[PDB]
PDB file of C-alpha atoms and ligand atoms in Angstrom:
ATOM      1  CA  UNK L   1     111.499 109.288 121.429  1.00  0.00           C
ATOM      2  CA  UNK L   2     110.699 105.530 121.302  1.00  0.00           C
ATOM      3  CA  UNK L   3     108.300 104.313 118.977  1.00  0.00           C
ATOM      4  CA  UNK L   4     107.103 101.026 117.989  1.00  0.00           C
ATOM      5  CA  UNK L   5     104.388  99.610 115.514  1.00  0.00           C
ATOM      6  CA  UNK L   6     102.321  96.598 115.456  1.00  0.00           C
ATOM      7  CA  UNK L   7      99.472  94.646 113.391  1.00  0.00           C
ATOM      8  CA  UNK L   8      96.717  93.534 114.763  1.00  0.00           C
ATOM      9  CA  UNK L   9      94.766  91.194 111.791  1.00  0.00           C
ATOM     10  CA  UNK L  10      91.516  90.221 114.117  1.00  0.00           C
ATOM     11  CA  UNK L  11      90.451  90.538 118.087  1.00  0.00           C
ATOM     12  CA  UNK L  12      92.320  87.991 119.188  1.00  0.00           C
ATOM     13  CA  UNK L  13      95.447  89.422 118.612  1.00  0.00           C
ATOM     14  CA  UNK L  14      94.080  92.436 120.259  1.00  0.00           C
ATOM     15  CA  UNK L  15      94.283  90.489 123.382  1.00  0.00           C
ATOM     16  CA  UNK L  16      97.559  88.053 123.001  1.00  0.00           C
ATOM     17  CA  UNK L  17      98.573  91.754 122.026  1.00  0.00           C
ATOM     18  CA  UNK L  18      96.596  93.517 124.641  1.00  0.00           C
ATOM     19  CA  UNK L  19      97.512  91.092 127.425  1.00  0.00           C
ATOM     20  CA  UNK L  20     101.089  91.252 126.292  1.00  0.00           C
ATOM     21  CA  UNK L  21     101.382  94.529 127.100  1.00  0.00           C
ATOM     22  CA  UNK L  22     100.706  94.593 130.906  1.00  0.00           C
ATOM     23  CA  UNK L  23     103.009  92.002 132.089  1.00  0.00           C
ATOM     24  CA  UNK L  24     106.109  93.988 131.323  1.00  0.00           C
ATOM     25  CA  UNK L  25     104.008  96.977 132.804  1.00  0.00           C
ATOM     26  CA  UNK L  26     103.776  94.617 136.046  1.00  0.00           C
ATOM     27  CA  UNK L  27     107.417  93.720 136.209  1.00  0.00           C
ATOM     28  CA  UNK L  28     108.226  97.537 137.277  1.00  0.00           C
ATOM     29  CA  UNK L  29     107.204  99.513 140.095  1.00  0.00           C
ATOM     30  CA  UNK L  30     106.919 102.918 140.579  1.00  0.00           C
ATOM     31  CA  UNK L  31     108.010 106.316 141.489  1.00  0.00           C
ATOM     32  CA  UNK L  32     105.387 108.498 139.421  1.00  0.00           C
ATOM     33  CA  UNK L  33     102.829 105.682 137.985  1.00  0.00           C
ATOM     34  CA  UNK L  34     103.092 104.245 134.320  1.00  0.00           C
ATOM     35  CA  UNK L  35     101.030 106.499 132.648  1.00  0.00           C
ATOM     36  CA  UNK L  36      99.269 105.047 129.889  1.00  0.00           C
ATOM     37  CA  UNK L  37      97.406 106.993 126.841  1.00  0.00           C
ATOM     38  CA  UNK L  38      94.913 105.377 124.624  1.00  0.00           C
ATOM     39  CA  UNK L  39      94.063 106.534 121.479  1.00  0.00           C
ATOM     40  CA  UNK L  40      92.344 106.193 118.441  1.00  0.00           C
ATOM     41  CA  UNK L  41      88.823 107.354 116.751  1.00  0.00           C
ATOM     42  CA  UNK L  42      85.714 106.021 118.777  1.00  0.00           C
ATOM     43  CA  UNK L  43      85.695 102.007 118.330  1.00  0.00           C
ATOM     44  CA  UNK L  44      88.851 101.210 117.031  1.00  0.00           C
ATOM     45  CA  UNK L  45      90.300  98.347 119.554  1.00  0.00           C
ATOM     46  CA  UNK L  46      90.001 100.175 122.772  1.00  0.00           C
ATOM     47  CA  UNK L  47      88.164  98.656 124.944  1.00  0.00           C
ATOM     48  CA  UNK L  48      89.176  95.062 122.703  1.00  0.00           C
ATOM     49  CA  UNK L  49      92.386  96.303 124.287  1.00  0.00           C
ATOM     50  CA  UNK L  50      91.834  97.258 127.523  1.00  0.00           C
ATOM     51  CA  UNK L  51      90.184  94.139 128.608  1.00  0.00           C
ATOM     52  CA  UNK L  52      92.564  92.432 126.734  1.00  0.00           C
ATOM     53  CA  UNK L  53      95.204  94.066 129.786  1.00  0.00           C
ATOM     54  CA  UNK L  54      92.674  93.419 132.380  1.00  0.00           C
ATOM     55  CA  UNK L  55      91.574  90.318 132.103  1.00  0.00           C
ATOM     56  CA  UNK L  56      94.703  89.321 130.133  1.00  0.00           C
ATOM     57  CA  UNK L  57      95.446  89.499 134.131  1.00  0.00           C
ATOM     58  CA  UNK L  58      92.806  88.018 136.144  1.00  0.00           C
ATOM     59  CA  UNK L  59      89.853  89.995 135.693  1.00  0.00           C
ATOM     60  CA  UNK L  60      86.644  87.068 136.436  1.00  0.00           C
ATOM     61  CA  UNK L  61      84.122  89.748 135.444  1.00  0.00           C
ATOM     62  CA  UNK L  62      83.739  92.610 132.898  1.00  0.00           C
ATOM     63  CA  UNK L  63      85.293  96.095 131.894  1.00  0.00           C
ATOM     64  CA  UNK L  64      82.229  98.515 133.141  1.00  0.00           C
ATOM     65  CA  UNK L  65      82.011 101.314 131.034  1.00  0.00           C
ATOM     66  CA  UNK L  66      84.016 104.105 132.277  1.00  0.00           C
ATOM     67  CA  UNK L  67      81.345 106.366 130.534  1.00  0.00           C
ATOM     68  CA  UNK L  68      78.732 107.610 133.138  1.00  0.00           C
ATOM     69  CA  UNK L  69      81.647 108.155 135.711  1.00  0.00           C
ATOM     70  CA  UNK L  70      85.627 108.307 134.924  1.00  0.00           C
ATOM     71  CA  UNK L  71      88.007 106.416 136.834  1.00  0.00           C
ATOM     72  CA  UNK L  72      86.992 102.426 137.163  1.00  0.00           C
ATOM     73  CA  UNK L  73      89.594 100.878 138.855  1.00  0.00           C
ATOM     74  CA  UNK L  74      91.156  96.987 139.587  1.00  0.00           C
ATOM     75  CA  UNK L  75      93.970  95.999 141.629  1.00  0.00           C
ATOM     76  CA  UNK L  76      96.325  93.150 140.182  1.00  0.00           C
ATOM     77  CA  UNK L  77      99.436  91.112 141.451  1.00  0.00           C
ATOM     78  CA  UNK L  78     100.901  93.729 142.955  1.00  0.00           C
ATOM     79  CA  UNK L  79      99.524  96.466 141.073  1.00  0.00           C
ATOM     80  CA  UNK L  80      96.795  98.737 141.557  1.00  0.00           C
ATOM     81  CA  UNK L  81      94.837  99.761 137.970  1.00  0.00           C
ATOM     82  CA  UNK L  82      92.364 102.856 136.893  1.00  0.00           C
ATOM     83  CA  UNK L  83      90.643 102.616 133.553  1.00  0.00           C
ATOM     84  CA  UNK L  84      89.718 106.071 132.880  1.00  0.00           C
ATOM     85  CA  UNK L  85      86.741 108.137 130.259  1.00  0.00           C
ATOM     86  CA  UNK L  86      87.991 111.806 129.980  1.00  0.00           C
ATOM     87  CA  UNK L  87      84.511 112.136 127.287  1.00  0.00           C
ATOM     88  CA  UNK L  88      82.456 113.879 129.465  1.00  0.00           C
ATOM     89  CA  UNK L  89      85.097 115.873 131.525  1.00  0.00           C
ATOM     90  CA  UNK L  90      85.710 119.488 129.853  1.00  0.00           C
ATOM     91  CA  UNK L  91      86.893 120.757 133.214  1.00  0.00           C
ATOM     92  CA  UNK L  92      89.544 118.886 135.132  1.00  0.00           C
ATOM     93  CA  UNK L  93      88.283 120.202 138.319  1.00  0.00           C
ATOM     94  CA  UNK L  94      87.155 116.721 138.508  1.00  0.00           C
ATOM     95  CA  UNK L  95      90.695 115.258 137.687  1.00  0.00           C
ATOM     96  CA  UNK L  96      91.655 116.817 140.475  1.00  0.00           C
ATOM     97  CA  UNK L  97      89.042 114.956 142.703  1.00  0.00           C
ATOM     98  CA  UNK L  98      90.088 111.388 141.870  1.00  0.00           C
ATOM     99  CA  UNK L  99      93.820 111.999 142.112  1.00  0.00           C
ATOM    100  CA  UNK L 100      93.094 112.575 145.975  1.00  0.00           C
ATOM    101  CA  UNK L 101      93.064 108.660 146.357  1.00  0.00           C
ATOM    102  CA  UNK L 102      96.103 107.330 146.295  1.00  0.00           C
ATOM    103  CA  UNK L 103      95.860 107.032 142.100  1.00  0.00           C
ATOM    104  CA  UNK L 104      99.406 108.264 141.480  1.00  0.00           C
ATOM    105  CA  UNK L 105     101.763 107.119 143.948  1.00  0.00           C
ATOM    106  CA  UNK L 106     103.677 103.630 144.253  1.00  0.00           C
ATOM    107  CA  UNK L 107     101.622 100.205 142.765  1.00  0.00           C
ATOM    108  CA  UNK L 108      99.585 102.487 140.309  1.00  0.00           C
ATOM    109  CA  UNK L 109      99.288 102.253 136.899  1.00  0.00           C
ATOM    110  CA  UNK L 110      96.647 104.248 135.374  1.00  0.00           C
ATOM    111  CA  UNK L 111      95.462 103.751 131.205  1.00  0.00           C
ATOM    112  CA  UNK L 112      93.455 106.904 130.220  1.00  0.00           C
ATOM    113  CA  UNK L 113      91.341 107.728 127.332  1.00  0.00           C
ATOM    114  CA  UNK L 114      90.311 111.064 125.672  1.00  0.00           C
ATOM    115  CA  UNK L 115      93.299 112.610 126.656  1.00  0.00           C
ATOM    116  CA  UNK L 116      92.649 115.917 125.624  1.00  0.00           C
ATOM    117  CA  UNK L 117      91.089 117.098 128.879  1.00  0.00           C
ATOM    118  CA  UNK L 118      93.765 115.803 131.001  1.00  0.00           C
ATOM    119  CA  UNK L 119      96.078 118.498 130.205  1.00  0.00           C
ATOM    120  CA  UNK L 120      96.378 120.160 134.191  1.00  0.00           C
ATOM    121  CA  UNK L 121      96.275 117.371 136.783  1.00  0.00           C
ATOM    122  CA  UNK L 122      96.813 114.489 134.868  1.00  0.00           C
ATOM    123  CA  UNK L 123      99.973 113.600 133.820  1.00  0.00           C
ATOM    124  CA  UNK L 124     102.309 113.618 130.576  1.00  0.00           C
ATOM    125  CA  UNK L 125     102.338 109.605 129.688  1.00  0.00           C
ATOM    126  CA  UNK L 126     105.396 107.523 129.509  1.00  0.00           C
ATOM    127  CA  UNK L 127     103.820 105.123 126.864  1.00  0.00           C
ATOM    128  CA  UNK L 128     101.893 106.998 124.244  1.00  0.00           C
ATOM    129  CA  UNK L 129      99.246 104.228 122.883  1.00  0.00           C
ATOM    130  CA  UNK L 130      98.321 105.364 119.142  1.00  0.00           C
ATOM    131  CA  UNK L 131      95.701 102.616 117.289  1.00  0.00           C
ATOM    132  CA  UNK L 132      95.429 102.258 113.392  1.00  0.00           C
ATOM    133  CA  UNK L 133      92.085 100.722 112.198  1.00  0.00           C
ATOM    134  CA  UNK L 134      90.076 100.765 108.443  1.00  0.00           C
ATOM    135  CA  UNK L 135      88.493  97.414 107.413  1.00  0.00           C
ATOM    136  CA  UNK L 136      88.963  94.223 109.835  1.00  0.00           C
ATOM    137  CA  UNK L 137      92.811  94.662 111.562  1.00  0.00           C
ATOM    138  CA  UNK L 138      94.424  97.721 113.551  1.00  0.00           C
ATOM    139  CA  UNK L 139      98.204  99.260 113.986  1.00  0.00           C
ATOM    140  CA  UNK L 140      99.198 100.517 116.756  1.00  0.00           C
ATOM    141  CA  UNK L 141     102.459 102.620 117.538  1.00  0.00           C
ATOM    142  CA  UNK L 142     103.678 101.894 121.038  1.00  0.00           C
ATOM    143  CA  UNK L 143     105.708 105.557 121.676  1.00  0.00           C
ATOM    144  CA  UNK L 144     107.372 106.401 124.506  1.00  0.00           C
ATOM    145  CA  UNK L 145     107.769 110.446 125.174  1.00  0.00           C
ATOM    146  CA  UNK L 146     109.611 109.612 128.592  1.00  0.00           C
ATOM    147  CA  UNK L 147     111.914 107.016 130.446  1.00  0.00           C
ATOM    148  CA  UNK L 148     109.962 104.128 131.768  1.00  0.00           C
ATOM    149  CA  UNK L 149     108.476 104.598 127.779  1.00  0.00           C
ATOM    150  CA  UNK L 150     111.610 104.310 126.272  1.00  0.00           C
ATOM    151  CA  UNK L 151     111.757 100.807 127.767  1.00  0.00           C
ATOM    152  CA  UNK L 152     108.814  99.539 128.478  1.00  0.00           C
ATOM    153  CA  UNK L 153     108.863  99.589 124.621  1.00  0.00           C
ATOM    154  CA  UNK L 154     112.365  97.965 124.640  1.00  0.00           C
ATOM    155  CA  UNK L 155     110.433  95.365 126.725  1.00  0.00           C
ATOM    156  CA  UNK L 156     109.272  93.989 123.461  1.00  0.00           C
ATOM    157  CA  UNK L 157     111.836  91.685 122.268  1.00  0.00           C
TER     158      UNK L 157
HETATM  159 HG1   HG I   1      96.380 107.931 137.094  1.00  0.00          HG
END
């Protein structure tokens, strides 16, 4: 109900891009967290993006894989923060184990991959993250199905 679209020549504008993007997500609190979806086919400026949010925040280290677990998580000014590989879920029996931790409620902000599996449990996102990539650059629509999507978009300007 919000979209958005935006080029992305090289990596760094991943990350002026991808750390962009999580300031305005930690200027807001939160009732139900931020959810946030990441998309696009396998190695297409996700992770480039994701770190680009994390350490476009503070993060002195690296983004572990999410891949022989699920849910890596960070805490940053004031926020709490839960990467998240959905690849080797098929049943979200194990969404439902995570979710038991204080994941959803206030200071959370959660960015999921893989989405399909998280259907149950996990939540419908307020920013859907959609990434465009063929030769060198990426796109990227910035949609908003809900409320805090509508403008967190809007938060662009
Ligand atoms: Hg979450």
């Amino acid at each position: 109900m919000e979209s958005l679209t935006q080029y992305i020549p090289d990596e760094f504008s991943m990350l002026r891009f991808g750390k962009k993007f999580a300031e305005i997500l930690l200027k807001l609190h939160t009732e139900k967290a931020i959810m946030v979806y990441l998309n696009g086919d396998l190695g297409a400026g996700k992770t480039t993006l994701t770190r680009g949010m994390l350490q476009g925040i503070g993060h002195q280290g690296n983004v572990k894989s999410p891949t022989y677990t699920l849910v890596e998580e960070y805490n940053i000014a004031g926020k709490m923060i839960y990467h998240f590989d959905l690849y080797r879920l098929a049943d979200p029996e194990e969404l439902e184990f995570m979710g038991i931790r204080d994941y959803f409620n206030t200071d959370s902000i959660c960015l999921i991959e893989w989405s399909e599996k998280g259907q149950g449990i996990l939540p419908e996102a307020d920013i859907l993250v959609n990434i465009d990539y063929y030769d060198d650059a990426r796109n990227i629509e910035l949609i908003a199905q809900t409320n805090l999507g509508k403008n967190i978009i809007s938060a662009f300007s």
